[PDB]
Design a protein around this ligand. Structure first.
Ligand SMILES: [Mg+2]
Ligand SMILES: [Mg+2]
Ligand SMILES: [Mg+2]
Ligand SMILES: [Mg+2]
Ligand SMILES: [Mg+2]
Ligand SMILES: [Mg+2]
Ligand SMILES: [Mg+2]
Ligand SMILES: [Mg+2]
Ligand SMILES: [Mg+2]
Ligand SMILES: [Mg+2]
Ligand SMILES: [Mg+2]
Ligand SMILES: [Mg+2]
Ligand SMILES: [Mg+2]
Ligand SMILES: [Mg+2]
Ligand SMILES: [Mg+2]
Ligand SMILES: [Mg+2]
Ligand SMILES: [Mg+2]
Ligand SMILES: [Mg+2]
Ligand SMILES: [Mg+2]
Ligand SMILES: [Mg+2]
Ligand SMILES: [Mg+2]
Ligand SMILES: [Mg+2]
Ligand SMILES: [Mg+2]
Ligand SMILES: [Mg+2]
Ligand SMILES: [Mg+2]
Ligand SMILES: [Mg+2]
Ligand SMILES: [Mg+2]
Ligand SMILES: [Mg+2]
Ligand SMILES: [Mg+2]
Ligand SMILES: [Mg+2]
Ligand SMILES: [Mg+2]
Ligand SMILES: [Mg+2]
Ligand SMILES: [Mg+2]
Ligand SMILES: [Mg+2]
Ligand SMILES: [Mg+2]
Ligand SMILES: [Mg+2]
Ligand SMILES: [Mg+2]
Ligand SMILES: [Mg+2]
Ligand SMILES: [Mg+2]
Ligand SMILES: [Mg+2]
Ligand SMILES: [Mg+2]
Ligand SMILES: [Mg+2]
Ligand SMILES: [Mg+2]
Ligand SMILES: [Mg+2]
Ligand SMILES: [Mg+2]
Ligand SMILES: [Mg+2]
Ligand SMILES: [Mg+2]
Ligand SMILES: [Mg+2]
Ligand SMILES: [Mg+2]
Ligand SMILES: [Mg+2]
Ligand SMILES: [Mg+2]
Ligand SMILES: [Mg+2]
Ligand SMILES: [Mg+2]
Ligand SMILES: [Mg+2]
Ligand SMILES: [Mg+2]
Ligand SMILES: [Mg+2]
Ligand SMILES: [Mg+2]
Ligand SMILES: [Mg+2]
Ligand SMILES: [Mg+2]
Ligand SMILES: [Mg+2]
Ligand SMILES: [Mg+2]
Ligand SMILES: [Mg+2]
Ligand SMILES: [Mg+2]
Ligand SMILES: [Mg+2]
Ligand SMILES: [Mg+2]
Ligand SMILES: [Mg+2]
Ligand SMILES: [Mg+2]
Ligand SMILES: [Mg+2]
Ligand SMILES: [Mg+2]
Ligand SMILES: [Mg+2]
Ligand SMILES: [Mg+2]
Ligand SMILES: [Mg+2]
Ligand SMILES: [Mg+2]
Ligand SMILES: [Mg+2]
Ligand SMILES: [Mg+2]
Ligand SMILES: [Mg+2]
Ligand SMILES: [Mg+2]
Ligand SMILES: [Mg+2]
Ligand SMILES: [Mg+2]
Lengths: 96, 51, 64, 76
RNA sequence: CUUUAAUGUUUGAUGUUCUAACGUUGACCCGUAAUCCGGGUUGCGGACAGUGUCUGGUGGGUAGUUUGACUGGGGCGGUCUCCUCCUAAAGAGUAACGGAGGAGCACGAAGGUUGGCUAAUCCUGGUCGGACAUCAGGAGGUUAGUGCAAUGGCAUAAGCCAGCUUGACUGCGAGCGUGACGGCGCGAGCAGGUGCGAAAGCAGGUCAUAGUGAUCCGGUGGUUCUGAAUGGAAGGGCCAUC
RNA sequence: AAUUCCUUGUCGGGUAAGUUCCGACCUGCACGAAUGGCGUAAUGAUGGCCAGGCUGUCUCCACCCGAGACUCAGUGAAAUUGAACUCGCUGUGAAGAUGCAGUGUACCCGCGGCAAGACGGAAAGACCCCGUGAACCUUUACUAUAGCUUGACACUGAACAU
RNA sequence: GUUUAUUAAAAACACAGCACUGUGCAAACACGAAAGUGGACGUAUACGGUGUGACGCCUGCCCGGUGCCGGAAGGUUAAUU
RNA sequence: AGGACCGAACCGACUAAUGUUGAAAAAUUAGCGGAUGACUUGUGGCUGGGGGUGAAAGGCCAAUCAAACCGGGAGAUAGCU
RNA sequence: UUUUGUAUAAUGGGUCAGCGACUUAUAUUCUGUAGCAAGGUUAACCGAAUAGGGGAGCCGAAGGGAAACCGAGUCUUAACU
């Protein structure tokens, strides 16, 4: 990154932002991941026991990626508007 | 050189302010122009305060 | 040994979805009264690192 | 000994010449004062920069009682 | 509410005196065949001196280092960023310790708009009044003017005078110019809310081109952000600014 | 003038002739009173100048006596060295040529001598500049710091008086 | 008399003498994280430091600057509280 | 009597020549200064490297001195050849 | 070898023989090639086992935003054509 003495690029530019300690313990889940679990329920714990999310994740959301083609129930996760309708199209329910 | 810096402050209590310069020797009169406050989204009185 | 990241550089760049980098613009920290609102307004959203620089930047951020 | 100074050149002049196809916005001339005057579909900036106000082709002409030079966009 | 007085009394300041800490490189006794050391007796000093911790001064006594570059060798002198003209070879750009000059601001009007207006200079006549003040006529036609250099502009004036005013607005921005980059510049049109004008319209500072300083580290105000068990808070982010 | 730049100042003496020397003058570029001023007998392998004596120092060298040099016998180094069939001149050319061009001269090989050249040998120029090299020295450069010094608390107590 | 052992022997250093200044003895000062030791088994006619340099005749004026010496009315000023 | 005088031993080192791959990493030859004193010399002892010692030349501290030698940090670093 | 440029009178080599300079480890990116493929691959360790076990983890299949957060969208603004 040394340019010969000219104030280098990573120093003539300003710093910005702060890191979130929350983002670390958060996860996303694809629709192609809902069949992967055993039991037809999707809790934070089943996800962890199917090795979908790491053992220290506290919050998870399901996003519209891939496809569900089996009835599932989903407890405690957040779900996107789009992913919601996909889960329902299969004949799955979204408790909390 | 001689022109100081000042802040003009909204009368709509929002906090929002503009900044400008002033010759205080020649024209020592608390400047009161009227500007658009975007926190209430209306033109109001603004009144010279100190930077 | 693992390469060490250049820590100052990692506070001024985030990588984007096609492998570019975004940075804040210079000239917007102080001495603002004498600058025009137009100039300051355009200087407010984040930018993309240009092609000349982008070799220098990747060198500094190997784990980006 | 008392000399040795100069300023940085400003790259003034014609950017788009007669007949060139331009897009609305494009700069035609950069100049000091109105050595050229804006004509039809052409604006004049605060540093007398002439720019196209509509897609089309650049056209120079001499017109008026002073024999001034004008720049216009034919909307071809 | 006592202007204020005495007595007790918690405490400081100042000195006097005292001995019991401590000093003794005074005398004598023993360990002891010993001018060391220790113990003992006596004298002299005595809360002083002195030492530890903390602190202001002083400190080339000693230590670590710094003390620019360009340059018809180096040194001396000059220069180092920005604007204007020429060199520059009729697009852009283009060097020299080449030739000439400026800037490091100023303006709440000297900005916006509407309405109106036209210069220099000479001549002729005219109280003080003169080569030159103000008045009248003529010739003249921008040879004037432009807040400040030079160049390019300027009469539909961008020059001069008036009324009303704050567009020296906030969010944005098709497209384009200029740079290795950081950056800098021009901009029609959208959205909100303004000013002037009967209106069409015009206005996002000033005839244009100088009037300037990255990042870090801090300050001030604001903030549907974050807040290390939880609620707060501190700190951090974001927006405005120094 | 151990000091005077101008300067070989000017005047006097010494010499046929004296930028030095001795005596004066004062116009002290830029002397001066214990970082002493001006004198001073004696002393000095001390600096400058003049005489007598003496001389191969010199005019201008000559001869001689010894040790090398030279020849024979024995023993036997060294620095240096890209390779050499290793001439002159005038041109040319990284600009001063044994080696290039033109030309002139020159049978092959030793020995004693001489030093004009091989930009001869020796030491990665000490001058000069450069390197964000080094060392040591200076100081009212910067930052510190031992030492010296000030105060507070500790070791550290008693009584009285104001 | 002394000196650059190995390119400088001198006008340089030393010197007897002169002055200033410090120092009351557990002296000043110096070597030592200290104990100690030198000074000195000395005591101001002594000891250390500085400059000058036999002897003769002498050593003028300036205390604004910088150091040192004395002062302590006022201004400014640390830890601490 | 004397840091008195002339001059050997003894201690020095002013001039010149030679030598300079030396007889010699400082000498030889001819002269030269001191030679009863701040003289010279034998044996032993003490002072240690930012330290000593210095009649002071940055002199000397084992042919080495504006910071000795030997081992270590060490393959210091070398935008230079 | 170094240079704008060397027969150069610029540098280096007396000659021969032997030795003498882009390596090693660990990370990361790109290219070739092999395996498997919306998945791929295990580390320590267990195991006599180059086998087998071990999926702790790493990388990828989703981005945008400083962030809460939303999510094939998201940020920007009171709101975007
Ligand atoms: Mg710099
Ligand atoms: Mg896991
Ligand atoms: Mg800010
Ligand atoms: Mg120019
Ligand atoms: Mg405009
Ligand atoms: Mg020093
Ligand atoms: Mg250092
Ligand atoms: Mg240095
Ligand atoms: Mg230089
Ligand atoms: Mg041109
Ligand atoms: Mg041309
Ligand atoms: Mg050029
Ligand atoms: Mg130039
Ligand atoms: Mg104006
Ligand atoms: Mg008008
Ligand atoms: Mg008149
Ligand atoms: Mg008239
Ligand atoms: Mg004119
Ligand atoms: Mg105007
Ligand atoms: Mg665009
Ligand atoms: Mg109206
Ligand atoms: Mg202007
Ligand atoms: Mg800091
Ligand atoms: Mg909260
Ligand atoms: Mg909490
Ligand atoms: Mg002379
Ligand atoms: Mg005479
Ligand atoms: Mg004479
Ligand atoms: Mg004389
Ligand atoms: Mg003198
Ligand atoms: Mg003097
Ligand atoms: Mg005197
Ligand atoms: Mg004196
Ligand atoms: Mg004297
Ligand atoms: Mg005299
Ligand atoms: Mg004599
Ligand atoms: Mg002598
Ligand atoms: Mg004599
Ligand atoms: Mg004679
Ligand atoms: Mg023989
Ligand atoms: Mg020639
Ligand atoms: Mg020749
Ligand atoms: Mg020939
Ligand atoms: Mg011969
Ligand atoms: Mg010879
Ligand atoms: Mg030679
Ligand atoms: Mg050299
Ligand atoms: Mg003598
Ligand atoms: Mg001697
Ligand atoms: Mg000598
Ligand atoms: Mg000698
Ligand atoms: Mg001396
Ligand atoms: Mg003591
Ligand atoms: Mg003396
Ligand atoms: Mg006084
Ligand atoms: Mg006096
Ligand atoms: Mg005092
Ligand atoms: Mg004698
Ligand atoms: Mg004698
Ligand atoms: Mg004698
Ligand atoms: Mg003798
Ligand atoms: Mg004799
Ligand atoms: Mg004698
Ligand atoms: Mg001995
Ligand atoms: Mg050592
Ligand atoms: Mg010297
Ligand atoms: Mg020696
Ligand atoms: Mg050293
Ligand atoms: Mg090391
Ligand atoms: Mg090495
Ligand atoms: Mg050359
Ligand atoms: Mg050639
Ligand atoms: Mg040559
Ligand atoms: Mg040759
Ligand atoms: Mg050479
Ligand atoms: Mg050669
Ligand atoms: Mg070579
Ligand atoms: Mg050679
Ligand atoms: Mg493959």
């Amino acid at each position: 990154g040394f340019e010969g003495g000219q104030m280098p690029l990573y120093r003539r530019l300003p710093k910005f932002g702060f890191t979130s300690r929350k983002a670390a313990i958060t996860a996303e889940v694809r629709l192609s991941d809902l069949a992967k679990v055993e039991g037809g329920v999707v809790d934070l714990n089943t996800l962890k026991a199917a090795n979908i999310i790491g053992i220290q994740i506290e919050f998870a959301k399901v996003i519209l990626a891939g496809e569900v083609t089996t009835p599932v129930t989903v407890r405690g996760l957040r779900v996107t508007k789009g992913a919601r309708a996909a889960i329902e199209a299969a004949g799955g329910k979204i408790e909390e | 050189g001689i022109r100081e810096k000042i802040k003009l402050v909204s009368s709509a209590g929002t906090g929002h302010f503009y900044t400008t310069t002033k010759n205080k020797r020649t024209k020592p009169e608390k400047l009161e122009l009227k500007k658009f406050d975007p926190v209430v989204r209306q033109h109001v009185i603004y009144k010279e305060a100190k930077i | 040994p693992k390469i060490k990241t250049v820590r100052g550089a990692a506070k001024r760049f985030k990588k984007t979805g096609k492998g570019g980098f975004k940075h804040k613009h210079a000239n917007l920290r102080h001495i603002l009264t004498k600058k025009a609102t137009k100039r300051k307004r355009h200087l407010r959203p984040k930018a993309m690192v240009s092609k000349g620089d982008l070799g220098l930047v990747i060198a500094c951020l190997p784990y980006a | 000994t008392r000399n040795g100074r100069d300023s940085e050149a400003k790259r003034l002049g014609v950017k788009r010449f007669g007949g060139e196809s331009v897009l609305a916005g494009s700069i035609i001339v950069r100049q000091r004062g109105t050595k050229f005057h804006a004509g039809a579909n052409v604006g004049c900036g605060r540093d007398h920069t002439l720019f196209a106000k509509a897609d089309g082709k650049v056209k120079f002409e001499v017109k008026g009682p002073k024999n001034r030079k004008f720049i216009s966009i034919e909307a071809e």
